[PDB]
Amino acid sequence: STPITGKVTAVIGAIVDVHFEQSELPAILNALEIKTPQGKLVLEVAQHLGENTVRTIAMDGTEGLVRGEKVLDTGGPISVPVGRETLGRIINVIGEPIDERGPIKSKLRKPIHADPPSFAEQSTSAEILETGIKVVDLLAPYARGGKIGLFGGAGVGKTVFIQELINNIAKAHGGFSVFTGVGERTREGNDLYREMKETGVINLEGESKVALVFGQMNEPPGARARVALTGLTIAEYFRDEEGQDVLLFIDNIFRFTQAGSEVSALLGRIPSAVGYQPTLATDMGLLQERITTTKKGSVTSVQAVYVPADDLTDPAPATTFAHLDATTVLSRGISELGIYPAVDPLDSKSRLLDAAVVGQEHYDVASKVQETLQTYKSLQDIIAILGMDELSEQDKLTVERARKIQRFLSQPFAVAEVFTGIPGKLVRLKDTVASFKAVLEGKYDNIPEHAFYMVGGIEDVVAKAEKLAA
Amino acid sequence: TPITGKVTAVIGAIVDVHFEQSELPAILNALEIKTPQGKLVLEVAQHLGENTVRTIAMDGTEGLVRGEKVLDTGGPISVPVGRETLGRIINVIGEPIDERGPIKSKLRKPIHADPPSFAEQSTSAEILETGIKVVDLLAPYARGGKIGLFGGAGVGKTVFIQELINNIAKAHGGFSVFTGVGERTREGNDLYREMKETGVINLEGESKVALVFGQMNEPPGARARVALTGLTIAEYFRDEEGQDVLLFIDNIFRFTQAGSEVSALLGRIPSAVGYQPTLATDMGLLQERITTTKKGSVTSVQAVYVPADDLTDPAPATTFAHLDATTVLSRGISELGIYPAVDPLDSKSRLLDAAVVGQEHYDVASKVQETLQTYKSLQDIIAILGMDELSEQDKLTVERARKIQRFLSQPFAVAEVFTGIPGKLVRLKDTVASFKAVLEGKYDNIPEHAFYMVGGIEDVVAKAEKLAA
Amino acid sequence: EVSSILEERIKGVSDEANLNETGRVLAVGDGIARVFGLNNIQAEELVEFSSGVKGMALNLEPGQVGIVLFGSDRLVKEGELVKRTGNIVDVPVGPGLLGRVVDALGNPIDGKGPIDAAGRSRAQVKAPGILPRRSVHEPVQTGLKAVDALVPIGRGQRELIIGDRQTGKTAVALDTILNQKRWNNGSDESKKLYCVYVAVGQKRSTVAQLVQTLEQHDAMKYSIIVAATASEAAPLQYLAPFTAASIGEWFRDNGKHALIVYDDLSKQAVAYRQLSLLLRRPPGREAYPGDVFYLHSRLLERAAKLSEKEGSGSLTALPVIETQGGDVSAYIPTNVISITDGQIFLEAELFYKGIRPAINVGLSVSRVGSAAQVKALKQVAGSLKLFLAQYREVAAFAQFGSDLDASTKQTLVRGERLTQLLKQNQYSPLATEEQVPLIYAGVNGHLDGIELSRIGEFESSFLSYLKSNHNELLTEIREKGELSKELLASLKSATESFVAT
Amino acid sequence: TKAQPTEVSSILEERIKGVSDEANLNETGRVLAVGDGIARVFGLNNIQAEELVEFSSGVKGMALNLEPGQVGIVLFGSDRLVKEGELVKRTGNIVDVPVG
Amino acid sequence: LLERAAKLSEKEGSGSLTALPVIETQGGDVSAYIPTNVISITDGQIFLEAELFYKGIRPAINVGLSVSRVGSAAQVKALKQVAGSLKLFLAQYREVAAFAQ
Amino acid sequence: PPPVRLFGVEGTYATALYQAAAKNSSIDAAFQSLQKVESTVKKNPKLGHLLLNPALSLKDRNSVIDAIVETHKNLDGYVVNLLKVLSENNRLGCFEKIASDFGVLNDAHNGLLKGTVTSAEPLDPKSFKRIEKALSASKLVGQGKSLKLENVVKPEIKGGLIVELGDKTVDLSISTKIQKLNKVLED
Amino acid sequence: VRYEASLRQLEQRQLAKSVISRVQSELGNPKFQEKVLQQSISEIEQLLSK
Structure with missing residues (x-):
């Protein structure tokens, strides 16, 4: 209903309580505005405390707030703007441009809260998406209508991996995208914004094919949580009202988990296991189900995930591991060994791997590859203790193919012309299947291990062999 | 009227008063209930409002009638200090428990002091000799230094401090301090007697040692302000006089322990493990009231009691930052039979560098640290495989490390009884040599068992002849 | 005269006008108080105790407003009035803190020459945008061969030096300040570095040798030291990084370049632990309160590289974590790690192996890439x-x-x-x-x-x-x-x- | 002295006005305060433990805690549309599912 | 409790109260809180091994952990x-x- | 409705009491009567100092309540029912409390702005009239609100005086200045 | 030398106590009554100025 005036009673930090007029209250999830020195503070009603006093979360700083300061009721939820003018704007939690290219101008706006789509709509993935990187393609493909999850450790080149995807998958596959950054850092904001300017995907002459929602970790915990909602709501607008296909991207979604744990304690919620939120289960489930393919568009999320202190059975990574269709793990070790992709080729499971969906050849090759690496790792104890020359002829051949597969999993990346300097080359899904098969068969065990390093398909590997020879 | 009150509560040994007028009390003041059992001393530490203080109790609260009268002294707890204050034992309530009669009062000063300034600093830059080999080589003392001691107080940690008292205090410090929080009362009588025997305390007149012990009989709050009392005696020597100071402490972990005990009652919410939520600030105040000034340098030797031998707990841990040097003592080296029980890979000093103790001292010490650590890595392989199933270079290192390790034991004058081997001290200057020689293979001919319980470098050689015959 | 200076003090006490608020003290102790009254208060504001203590106010309640004391509680007494300044907490920033040690309030504590101020600054200054941000520029070296090659840092970037206490932690940092000599002396003020070193929970003797060593090498003509010792009040220890940041921001703002060392954030969390538990905020894991992350996260992002319209300014930060017990799977380490671009893990064992100051090259990473060297x-x-x-x-x-x-x-x-x-x-x-x-x-x-x-x-x-x-x-x-x-x-x-x- | 969660200012002025209770608390309940999906009702004096309740919002609950000053309903659904001062009918049927 | 047991001087009549505080260990325990609290108060230990007692050697003392530091005449x-x-x-x-x- | 929310716990009662009594326009009556029935509990020196704090059941206390309203019939119907509410929850120690708050609420309605003008020593009566005049002239009391001056002697105020009312204060004491000075002495 | 510099500080504390002393004197005399009157009339003057 119509505006109300409440006067603040306690500022403790992010939680700020208001004491509205009797017999007349704003509802749960409404938006209250308090005019503040630096923007307009929007308060999300998240509890009622009884006696006509609410308890709300700030989304802008809690510096210099008077307790007794008039609080207008807009009369509703937090509503950001959605549209085709969302493309190229840099949007933030309270829903306004911070790049000053003008507000998103549309007849339609939407609330940040929404209910996950109904069962009748739901659609499953069955097509196999092509990434254009050899490790991803053979041993863990993507599924278009996927909720891929980029779990990874420290020093893996997190930004690097995801930046490669945008170079390849994004231009090739139609539809718009929304790139949403949850608790990002100012190094990463500039580097991501710069990389998409190079590729002509951000047009400051045109409209962009991507939209951005950059909320940084220098904003209150409250805000960091609900930035995620703003970016998802735009993807919903693309999928439904325009009908568009979305290759959604979120970064880093451990940051959502961490943020959520913070406002939990403050709101009165008692601490649960390993210092994370109790309401873990339910916030993630609501977030994830919204991300799906319907009877309109098709949304394929690729979500960065950070595995604290390289343990992924810790309650934030491990819960998320289930909710994400197509997991990968990037690991400290493989980066150091000199191989970029940093992705572990062994721990990386998709929701579709079967032979009557990926294809019969694709399945039989990848069934071999997994076995070859798993043998070498098993053999490591024998090699380590007793000696390496006391292993059998079959074991040495398996070890030699395994080293070759490990260094024929090196692909260069265009966004690693910094990190490395060797420029990225795209290779097809089909081509990868074929290229990998030749190696197992033993027809290319004449090629040096290093003549498999950062090249394309088979053609480049044979040529590169000749090159080291010279 | 005088600020009188009534006893609203007696929750633990943390008594609560309620003043019957609205006249202003103040914090770090003292209040006295005249009880039929001696006197009772209380100290205001919080004001909770509605004319109700909450008080630390320095004396036993047993047998306490509630609604029984209090009076406000009007000011802080005041010790008596002096220069002839020496040769008596002082408790937190001012009195003697050694019964040598009234102390010389000249200046009586608050046990609560405002920490001196950063503009007055006379940092340690002159070395001191301890006369232990392990100590001199790896982590030598300094004058103004703050040394720490880790371990139990029954496994040889206490025996360690006795040696230190025997060497450092009979030939340095003109007026010297011993302060003991939760100090074992009969053992306290032993320290007093040994001090008398070596003629350091002569009656209750001029003496170059004073002592403060607050027994572990006393309830946790009383123990907490022992520490403070002792430091006030240390500061008079620091300020007025220019004469040499010392401090010996057994244990300031017991100050920390006492804080955890009081914490619940006062009105604080305990942080994890059990240690106070006010640990950094409370720790901070005593250790900035042990600090070098241009009014005099203050060499300190401190002891920390380690509960369950976990050093990873915040009370032992937060000390190191406030330290210059350590010589950590542990149960493991105690089992191995190495007395002193000091870890040789767990010692550190701020006097360790290649121009403070000079290049040669350093070079020797570095090599010793590499050798023992190499041996420590190879514990698995040696026991599970062998030493001939290990490379010839690492075997040399390993063979060397058993000799250097064994040599580190120094039978003491206060463990001479137990061992049956008369007490030893190995010089700083000798030490550099002793260890340097073994490193060059100049003494890797003679038994590991000859390196067990010897004094200097010549004795290692000489016992080799004793055991062989 | 001693008499002449006394005459001034007496004329400089007396008189004062209207007070926006009043309230009478009731609960108070540990250097934490709560007063009853005080209803024209807003967050971060300073209230003048009539003890002569100043305390800013961090918990607002419609009962008893919780004012963090910067002094002692032995001069606060139950019944006194407290009067609101009407001005939020501020620090002198100028050209005159350089060549001086200053405490967290920003006075000299070594009794060196006067603080010249050109301005005052605020403790919270919102961290730069992405529009005025710019790509990484200007290699910063420490003069340690492993650090430079493998984990190369840039100015406007964060890499976290982590590892067990006193395994050379202090030498790492002192080596970095020392290498900035080549540049400080050499021309161009945007190549010169004016370093700001922050010390939380550290004893005076250590700081006082340290500063001595910088004067010997003629590096204490630009070093500024911000200090809040262990004895001194817990709110000044929490408040110490954020006002040091402002002494740095002036450099970033003018176009000049600087480096801010934050040693250690871990004792800062304990000073803040005390503060948070006595203003009744409920804790999460290991009694650190859930808004700990929020503290480090806002802070570190105020060092980040700026564009050429703002003078190519960068404040650079090097946070230091001394782990009180070891283990980097602890709460405080997970929280700083997420914010920073790097780890520069140091190891105890490698100290004994003869590397001093000791660095492990394998548990250290730089996601900043190789072109920050x-x-x-x-x-x-x-x-x-x-x-x-x-x-x-x-x-x-x-x-x-x-x-x-x-x-x-x-x-x-x-x-x-x-x-x-x-x-x-x-x-x-x-x-x-x-x-x-x-x-x-x-x-x-x-x-x-x-x-x-x-x-x-x-x-x-x-x-x-x-x-x-x-x-x-x-x-x-x-x-x-x-x-x-x-x-x-x-x-x-x-x-x-x-x-x- | 002690603080009840039934010390609510609308509720108190009604008792002061010489009005008695137990006419709008029979089965009949009114939400006092709703937070975290945990509406707390004053009323429900003929309710069965574990019995199903319907709010005015369109939301369903069950009543795991019956405490004298208030009833801690656990909401099955939305928190968004639920607010203070809404009627909560008593189904008169304990939590049940079709079987066949 | 422990400081009630202790040898006294002639004045109080030369009387003693000998106290052996007896700790229930799970096959030896002295790296845990409860034992260590008793150790810092006591002058020493009488550590006796589990394995040896059980295999019919009594007494069975490990003297790497058995010390007493006032015991210089007490035999x-x-x-x-x-x-x-x-x-x-x-x-x-x-x-x-x-x-x- | 309440006009403003004042007081913490046991003010929820006081709030509620004013808003019930507000609908008739008789709070002044209610409150006066409450002073006179509260005082006759006090002039019950046994069981009216010895039954403020819980000591007997809800029911005996309730019957103590019934006996208090049968002996004093003027109390107004809001305050005869408020006592019932307090007795059933079984409290009487924070009985003076609701009473005190209810007075502040009432005197905001009367438009009195109660004030203490503490001094070091009792001032003259002329000094009083002049403070009342001046304080009206100063913009701290805009007018519309009728100031009262209450003299207090506090030898803890060492010299000077403090004028206090509402949220507006002028501290023109000597005592504070001494405290500030004593700290400042360095030379 | 130490003591010599200590003596410079000491003279300042000797005069510091004259200030404390002088307060007891001010408040011992009915200058305590007369200046309290002065404080009431300053407040009046101040009250026209606000």
Whole structure:
């Protein structure tokens, strides 16, 4: 209903309580505005405390707030703007441009809260998406209508991996995208914004094919949580009202988990296991189900995930591991060994791997590859203790193919012309299947291990062999 | 009227008063209930409002009638200090428990002091000799230094401090301090007697040692302000006089322990493990009231009691930052039979560098640290495989490390009884040599068992002849 | 006169006008209070105690407003009035804090010359946007060969130095400030560094040697030290990073460049623990309150690189975490790690192995990439990383008297010689022109002929020989920071010439 | 002295006005305060433990805690549309599912 | 409790109260909180091994963890003279029987 | 409705009491009567100092309540029912409390702005009239609100005086200045 | 030398107590009554100025 005036009673930090007029209250999830020195503070009603006093979360700083300061009721939820003018704007939690290219101008706006789509709509993935990187393609493909999850450790080149995807998958596959950054850092904001300017995907002459929602970790915990909602709501607008296909991207979604744990304690919620939120289960489930393919568009999320202190059975990574269709793990070790992709080729499971969906050849090759690496790792104890020359002829051949597969999993990346300097080359899904098969068969065990390093398909590997020879 | 009150509560040994007028009390003041059992001393530490203080109790609260009268002294707890204050034992309530009669009062000063300034600093830059080999080589003392001691107080940690008292205090410090929080009362009588025997305390007149012990009989709050009392005696020597100071402490972990005990009652919410939520600030105040000034340098030797031998707990841990040097003592080296029980890979000093103790001292010490650590890595392989199933270079290192390790034991004058081997001290200057020689293979001919319980470098050689015959 | 100065004090007490609020003190102790009254208060504001204590106010409640005392509680007493300044907490920033030690309020505590102020600044200053941000620019070196090659830092970037207490933690940081000498002296004010060092929970004797050491090397003509010792009040210890940040921001704002060292954030959390538990905020894991992350996260992002319309300004930050117990799976380490670009893990064992100050090269990463270092120095260290990884794997095989082969023992020897070369020295940083030769030498296998003991003997002599003849090569590496075809051939011939001894 | 969660200012002025209770608390309930999906009702005096309740919002609950000053309903659904001062009918049927 | 037990002087009549505080260990325990609290108060330990007692050696004392630091006269002279430096000797013996194989 | 929310716990009652009594326009009556029935509990020196704090059941206390309203019939119907509410929850120690708050609420309605003008020593009566005049003239009391001056003697105020009312204060004491000075002495 | 510099500080504390002393004197006399009157009339003057 119509505006109300409440006067603040306690500022403790992010939680700020208001004491509205009797017999007349704003509802749960409404938006209250308090005019503040630096923007307009929007308060999300998240509890009622009884006696006509609410308890709300700030989304802008809690510096210099008077307790007794008039609080207008807009009369509703937090509503950001959605549209085709969302493309190229840099949007933030309270829903306004911070790049000053003008507000998103549309007849339609939407609330940040929404209910996950109904069962009748739901659609499953069955097509196999092509990434254009050899490790991803053979041993863990993507599924278009996927909720891929980029779990990874420290020093893996997190930004690097995801930046490669945008170079390849994004231009090739139609539809718009929304790139949403949850608790990002100012190094990463500039580097991501710069990389998409190079590729002509951000047009400051045109409209962009991507939209951005950059909320940084220098904003209150409250805000960091609900930035995620703003970016998802735009993807919903693309999928439904325009009908568009979305290759959604979120970064880093451990940051959502961490943020959520913070406002939990403050709101009165008692601490649960390993210092994370109790309401873990339910916030993630609501977030994830919204991300799906319907009877309109098709949304394929690729979500960065950070595995604290390289343990992924810790309650934030491990819960998320289930909710994400197509997991990968990037690991400290493989980066150091000199191989970029940093992705572990062994721990990386998709929701579709079967032979009557990926294809019969694709399945039989990848069934071999997994076995070859798993043998070498098993053999490591024998090699380590007793000696390496006391292993059998079959074991040495398996070890030699395994080293070759490990260094024929090196692909260069265009966004690693910094990190490395060797420029990225795209290779097809089909081509990868074929290229990998030749190696197992033993027809290319004449090629040096290093003549498999950062090249394309088979053609480049044979040529590169000749090159080291010279 | 005088600020009188009534006893609203007696929750633990943390008594609560309620003043019957609205006249202003103040914090770090003292209040006295005249009880039929001696006197009772209380100290205001919080004001909770509605004319109700909450008080630390320095004396036993047993047998306490509630609604029984209090009076406000009007000011802080005041010790008596002096220069002839020496040769008596002082408790937190001012009195003697050694019964040598009234102390010389000249200046009586608050046990609560405002920490001196950063503009007055006379940092340690002159070395001191301890006369232990392990100590001199790896982590030598300094004058103004703050040394720490880790371990139990029954496994040889206490025996360690006795040696230190025997060497450092009979030939340095003109007026010297011993302060003991939760100090074992009969053992306290032993320290007093040994001090008398070596003629350091002569009656209750001029003496170059004073002592403060607050027994572990006393309830946790009383123990907490022992520490403070002792430091006030240390500061008079620091300020007025220019004469040499010392401090010996057994244990300031017991100050920390006492804080955890009081914490619940006062009105604080305990942080994890059990240690106070006010640990950094409370720790901070005593250790900035042990600090070098241009009014005099203050060499300190401190002891920390380690509960369950976990050093990873915040009370032992937060000390190191406030330290210059350590010589950590542990149960493991105690089992191995190495007395002193000091870890040789767990010692550190701020006097360790290649121009403070000079290049040669350093070079020797570095090599010793590499050798023992190499041996420590190879514990698995040696026991599970062998030493001939290990490379010839690492075997040399390993063979060397058993000799250097064994040599580190120094039978003491206060463990001479137990061992049956008369007490030893190995010089700083000798030490550099002793260890340097073994490193060059100049003494890797003679038994590991000859390196067990010897004094200097010549004795290692000489016992080799004793055991062989 | 003593009398003349007394006369002034007396004339400077008396008189004052209306008070926005009043309230009478009730609960108070530990240097934390709550007063009853006080209804024109807003967050972060300062209220003047009539004790003569100043305390800002951090918990607002419609009962008793919770004001954090900067003083003692022995002068606060139950019944007194407190009067609101009407002005939020601020620190003098100017050209006059440099060459001085200052406490967290920003006075000298060493009684050096006057604080010249050009302005006042605020504790919370919202961290830059992405529009005025710019790409990484200007290599910052510490003068430690492993740090520079492998985990190279840039100015406007964060990499976290983590590891167990007093394993050389202080020497790491002191080496960094010392290498900024080459630049401080050399022209261009946006190449000069004015470093701001922050000390939380540290004892005075340590700070007082430390400053002495900087004066000896003539680095205390730009060093500013912000201090809040362990004894001094818990709100000043929490407040200490955020006002140090502002002494840095002035440098970033003017276009000038600077480096801010935050040692340690971990004791800062304990001062804040005390504060938070007595204003009744409920804690999460290990009694650290859930808004701890929020503290470090806002802070570190105020050092970040700016654009050319703002003068190419960068404040750079180097946070320091001393782990109180060891383990980096602890709460405080997970929270700083997420915010920062790097780890520069230091190790206890490696201290004893003879690397002092000791750095582990494998639990340290830089996601900042290789172009935050000298261009010349990237090229030479190009396979330095790769060689080291290869060593680590082969060494693991080597244990247990395992049968070795000729292929592997090339690697193992190769790796052994490099580590001995690398080993740091206490309190001595080095200049990049003379780091570029040694790494080259190691990489092209001219150091893989030379015996382990004589790694050092070669290192000293090789550098020495170059000063006499090849002073042209050093000059070019300094001047162009990139390496020419012609310049490499000569450098390569120079190495081939000296190999024995 | 002690603080009840039934010390609510609308509720108190009604008792002061010489109005008695137990006419709008029979089965009949009114939400006092709703937070975290945990509406707390004053009323429900004929309710069965574990019995199903329907709010005015369109939301369903069950009543795990019956405490004298308030009833801690656990909401099955939305928190968004539920607010203070809404009627909560008593189904008169304990939590049940079709079987067949 | 413990400081109520202790030898006294002539004044109080020379009387003593001998106290052996007896701790219930789960196969030896002295690296946990409860034992360590008793150790810092006591003058020493009488550590006796589980394995040895059980395999019918009584007494069965490990003297790497058995110390007392006031015990310099607290034995009849007869049992000190004959038992001359045997306490050093069996603290060489464990070390000898480790590497004698 | 309440006009403003004042007081913490046991003010929820006082709030509620004013808003019930507000609908008739007789709070002044209610409150006066409450002073007179509260005082006759006090002039019950046994069981009216010895039954403020819980000591007997809800029911005996309730019957103590019934007996208090049968002996004093003027109390107003809001305050005869408020007592019932307090007795059933079984409290009487924070009985003076609701009473005190209810007075502040009432005197905001009367438009009195109660004030203490503490001094070091009792001032003259002329000094009083002049403070009342001046304080009206000063913009701290805009007018519309009728100031009262209450003299207090506090020898803890060492010299000077403090004028206090509402949220507006002028501290023109000597005592504070001495405290500030004593700290400042360095030379 | 130490003591000599200590004596410079000491004279300042000797005069510091004259200030404390002088307060007891001010408040011992009915200058305590007369200046309290002065404080009431300053407040009046101040009250016209706000």
